[PDB]
Amino acid sequence: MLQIEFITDLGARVTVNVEHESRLLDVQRHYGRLGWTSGEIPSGGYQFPIENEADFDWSLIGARKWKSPEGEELVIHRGHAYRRRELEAVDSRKLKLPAAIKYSRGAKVSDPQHVREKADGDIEYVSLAIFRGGKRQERYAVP
Amino acid sequence: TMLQIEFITDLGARVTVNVEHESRLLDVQRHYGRLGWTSGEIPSGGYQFPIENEADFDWSLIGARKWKSPEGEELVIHRGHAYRRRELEAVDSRKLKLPAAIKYSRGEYVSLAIFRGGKRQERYAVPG
Amino acid sequence: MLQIEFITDLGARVTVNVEHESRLLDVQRHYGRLGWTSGEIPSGGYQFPIENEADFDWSLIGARKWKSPEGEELVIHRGHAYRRIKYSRGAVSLAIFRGGKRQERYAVP
Amino acid sequence: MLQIEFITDLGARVTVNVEHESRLLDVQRHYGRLGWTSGEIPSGGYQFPIENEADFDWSLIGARKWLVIHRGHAYRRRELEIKYSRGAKVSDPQHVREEYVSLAIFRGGKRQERYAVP
Amino acid sequence: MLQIEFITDLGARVTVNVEHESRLLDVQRHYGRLGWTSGEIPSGGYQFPIENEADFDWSLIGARKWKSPEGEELVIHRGHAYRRRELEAPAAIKYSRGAKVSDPQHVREKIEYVSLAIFRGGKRQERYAVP
DNA sequence: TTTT
DNA sequence: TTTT
Q1: Mind giving me the DSSP string for E41-106?
Q2: Chain D contact set for E61 (CB, 8 A)
Q3: Could you say what the effect of mutating residue 51 to A is (chain D)?
Q4: Burial code of C61-76, b = ≥16 C-beta within 10 A, e = fewer?
Q5: Cβ(B2)–Cβ(A17) under 8 Å?
Q6: Does residue B99 lie within 7 Å of nucleic acid chain F, judged by its CB?
Q7: Distance CA D27, CA D33 (A)
Q8: With contacts defined as CB-CB under 8 Å, which chain E residues touch D13?
Q9: Which of D8, D57, E20, E102 is deepest in the core (most CB within 10 A)?
């Protein structure tokens, strides 16, 4: 018997009961499709396997995909638009990382300091999700 | 299969209420919202609603109350504060493409709600 | 049922069950008498009608009133003293009584 | 009929059931002895009556005597003609930094029986 | 009958039921092994006795060890990597990462570091080790 | 449905 | 099949 705390699309603080733990993600999906979110966006965005990027179920984190005119695939999340960006592989010693897909947006004046991120060569940003390495998990994909 | 909604009452108390099903969730928010109870915070920039929901928006949904003076002055009360209604024309400039809007704000400066674009959603309206 | 969250006089975070909504204020008065508070003081202070000041039930916000026989009215809340319609101190007001329409349930019963 | 939210010695956010309002301070002592705390230390430290400094049950606020340890910090007894405090570390916020940081200050009031060791 | 609030591996705010207080650590290890965390890292990082360092149960705090391809011992916690640092004089072992613009000033230690945990002094507690 |  |  689990409980999960949500923030509705109206910003209301709501708690749902979950009969069995195994149903947790399906419940996040169910309320996430309505724009409901649980928790804050993790430091540097949610981190997922690269192989989950192309068919990721954005409703899992209360987000949705929208394709703009002039052909551009955006992610909307709590009233913010996030853009799909490429991150190059990292190469040095001692850190080697494969390339990544980053969904992110400019930091606005109303963004608190703990959600901001800064890398050299560009201005600060706020990241929603980073798809890098790992191994595909079916639970992240649209059913 | 019950839900719970956490409110801040008119006395600022932190109070939690039970809800039978997600169906009657908006009913409960209307109910306590008519009492001036609120749940959660005002998002930076104000709540964002469709322009077509403005005329008959249910202010109790966010614990607000709309008042209209004999002279037709529209004010909204929310957590003891008065917010005024302003109509904003569309903007087309080098950085902006903003459709027309109605905004409720006060001015410490703060915006409570902005009605702009989007599609009308029936659930936001005063029922009946 | 309902629940109400308090900070006790010792800082403890305690949640009290309430069997029926009609008695919420009574529960607030009960723990309010002990110096327990629920939630935070709104920025600018609480806002109450000016017509409620005289016999406002300070226990509702976990406060108590103090009147000196010398003629001084004070309000104690979370160990701070708010001089006296606005009740404020020097760090900030606790509550302001101005305008509005008088509400019966606020008054000391 | 009552619940209390603790931060355990490991930092876990844990909620405990309590029989009646009268059993509250004891539940606080019980978990306090394990170093669990409930809520925050108020600005300037907690406030207690000077006559309670004698037999004060430190377990009430998750503290222990060795000095007095609370959330892994050591506070020392100081006489002022009894405040407990410690020098401010580099990991302490600008708030609470009074630089020093106080846990408890004993001044005035009437000796409450509930505050002392039973 | 205790309850513990977790932040899951997906960021969800979730509350779990625990039968007896005695079984609490076992519940923390269980979900901690999936990356679930409870509460925040205290400033300066968790404090443990140095005799618990060698076989500390990292799952207790939602963490896991990993030896990277550069052969450096990491602890992964909430997506972040913390490096092991042997310090000598009071000697201690720190698990630290580089500070970021999102890290408040009081969390930083001085290049600026932020520590997950610190093993120093104290007396070895068996509950902290891998069962 | 929506889409900074 | 892992992170700055």
Answers
A1: PPTT-EEE-GGGSTTB-GGGGTEEEEE-TT--EEEEETTEEEEEEEE----EEEEEEE--TTS-GG
A2: 10-11
A3: Forms pentamers but not higher-ordered structures; binds ssDNA normally
A4: bbbebeeeeeeeeebb
A5: yes
A6: no
A7: 10
A8: 4-5, 38-39
A9: D8
